Amino acid sequence: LGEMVTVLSIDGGGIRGIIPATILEFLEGQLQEMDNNADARLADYFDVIGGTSTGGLLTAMISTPNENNRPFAAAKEIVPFYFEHGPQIFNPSGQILGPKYDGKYLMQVLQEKLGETRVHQALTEVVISSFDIKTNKPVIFTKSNLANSPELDAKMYDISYSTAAAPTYFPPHYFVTNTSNGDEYEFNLVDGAVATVADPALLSISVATRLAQKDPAFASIRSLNYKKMLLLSLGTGTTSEFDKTYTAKEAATWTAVHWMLVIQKMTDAASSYMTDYYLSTAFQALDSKNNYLRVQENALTGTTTEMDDASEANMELLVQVGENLLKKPVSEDNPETYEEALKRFAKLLSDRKKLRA
Incomplete structure (x- = not known):
């Protein structure tokens, strides 16, 4: 158990991020209860935390340090975050051209809550996805790979806005970092769901697997031994009920506008x-x-x-x-x-942490 690698992964899904946040409030509460520590946090038990869009927003808030080098947010503070800021994040701009939301409120609340923190300060390995529309490639923000590519040490609010910048919902994000030579490095990013990782659980375990090649703490999963891997993957829900789905017959005359609404x-x-x-x-x-x-x-x-x-x-x-x-x-x-x-999963996280002490 002591050698096991622990990975948390949270799907995208906009305001439906309340669903995995409710699950994580339950899990973190179990950890606090079992280890007799009201300050116990998810980042104390998970080696890797991955998230796309609102799953990435959540990841940034539970892995970014505060002044005491402790996670910025407790899992029970996430659902209140959506109730308080959700209505203003998703406040229609009413602008004739462009996306449904101007993203100004979303940028401001992420700047307020994350400050000037950078991905190198994350209290655990983070995996936050985006797609770059200029380079035409996925851009995945992690602490690993910062050695080879320091231009990837972006600000947490730039990363968090970008992972959630869904085409037609929010404008794409532009920001710059600096390379090893001091030269400017630009990012032109949209939501990680465009990188095909609305569910980033396999990306998260791939990042853990690559780390096993260079980090001794991850050595147990070195040659795909996922017997030594614990993975918690959280969804934001899907539907299969006819009333919310479509037929090939009705879709025969759909134009690009309708297709963009559902794709x-x-x-x-x-x-x-x-x-x-x-x-x-x-x-x-x-x-x-x-x-x-x-x-x-x-x-x-x-x-x-x-x-x-x-x-x-x-x-x-x-x-x-x-x-x-x-x-x-x-x-x-x-x-x-x-x-x-989840109680069983909490117990394994707790026993593994005690084993590594």
Whole structure:
């Protein structure tokens, strides 16, 4: 157990980020309870924390240090963050041209809460995704790879805005860092979901796997031994109910405007199904299916399907979705609930930390 590598991964999903935040409030509460430490934080137990879009916002807030070199936010402060700032982040600009939101409020709250902190200060390994529309490549922010590429030591608010800058919802982000020679290095970034990692769990374990080649703390997973890997992957939900989906017949005459409204919800649901399929395949092949815990809601209904609905009523329904998800089974023909599997996961995180002491 002591040699095991621990990875947390949080999906994108706009305001639906309330669902994994509710799950993480439960998990961090279990850790605090079990280790008799009210200051226990997720970053004290996880070697790697990965997130895309609002999952990346969450990652930045629970891994960025405050003045006492402790995580900026407790997991129970995330849902209040969405209730307080969600309505102003998703306040329509009403501008004729451009995205639905001007992103000014989102930039300001991230600047306020993250200050001048840089990714090299992260209290654990972070994996925050984006897509660069200038270089036409994914740009993944981590602490590792800063040795070879120091221009990647961006500010946490630049990284956090960029990972969530969804095309047609927010404007793309432009910012600059400096290279080893002192030359300027520019970023032209959009949401990590465009990099196909709306679910970044496989990217997170790949970053951990590369680190195993150079960091002794990660040596146990060196040659793909995912038996020594604990992975918690959190979804923001999908839907398969006919009332929210489409037929090929109706879609025959859709123009680019209608397709742009649905293409990202489709690619994000696909990223959830495909990433989970790759990971389940890998963990099952090593008879280590229970090392991978995927907490996902598969029947979102009503207003909860919209990632930018920050109305008080919808946010309250998302808390209920997260609280109900805890009581749901981990799979069909397995009555183990998510709450029970998360208590089991907390116990492993706690025992591993005590083992490394």
